[PDB]
């Protein structure tokens, strides 16, 4: 007959892994709007190679690079 | 003497057909990978308010801001 284990709630729980802070921004040709990026916080991190940069916006004046 | 005239001629003329002028990049929390942006050219434009900035990547070393 074979008591085949195909029915079992092996899952200990149901952790909703939901990256809500995942923002999808688009680039038109090679252009982009700053507000799309800084829609939540006023600083963005940019990984390149092995090092990490920070693109930051100031008050409402302009934006700059920082580490 | 086997008789069999093949009729299988579904030619895969359609290839890629995936243009990337409008590039959709995502942000994880507030982080992003530089290569996603500079996937085509090595300079990106960023509009903020009424003025326009340029985020540029160098050779493969690092990235900077420029106007």
How is this structure best described in words?
Chains A, B: It comes from Rhodopseudomonas palustris (strain ATCC BAA-98 / CGA009). Chains A, B: This is Hemin uptake protein HemP. Chains A, B: InterPro entries: Hemin_uptake_protein_HemP. Chains A, B: Residues 1-22 are annotated as: Disordered. The structure is a homodimer of 67-residue chains. Chain A is mostly beta strands. The first copy, chain A, has a domain at 26-67: Ribbon (Complement Module, domain 1), CATH 2.10.70. Chain A is 6% helix and 40% strand. In chain A, strands 3-4-5 form a three-stranded antiparallel sheet, with no helix packed on it. The termini of chain A are far apart.
The proportion of strand residues of chain A reads 35-45%
Overall structural class of chain A, as computed from helix and strand content, comes to: mainly beta
| Lateral arrangement of strands in the main beta sheet of chain A | 3-4-5
Major interchain interface with per-chain residue totals: A-B, 35 and 34 residues
* Assembly type: homodimer
Q: Gyration radius of chain A, to the nearest Å?
A: 22 Å
CATH architecture of one domain in chain A: Ribbon
Helix content of chain A: under 10%
Protein name (chains A, B): Hemin uptake protein HemP
Pfam families (chains A, B): hemP
PDB class: structural genomics, unknown function
Keywords: domain-swapped dimer, Structural Genomics, PSI, Protein Structure Initiative, Northeast Structural Genomics Consortium, nesg, unknown function
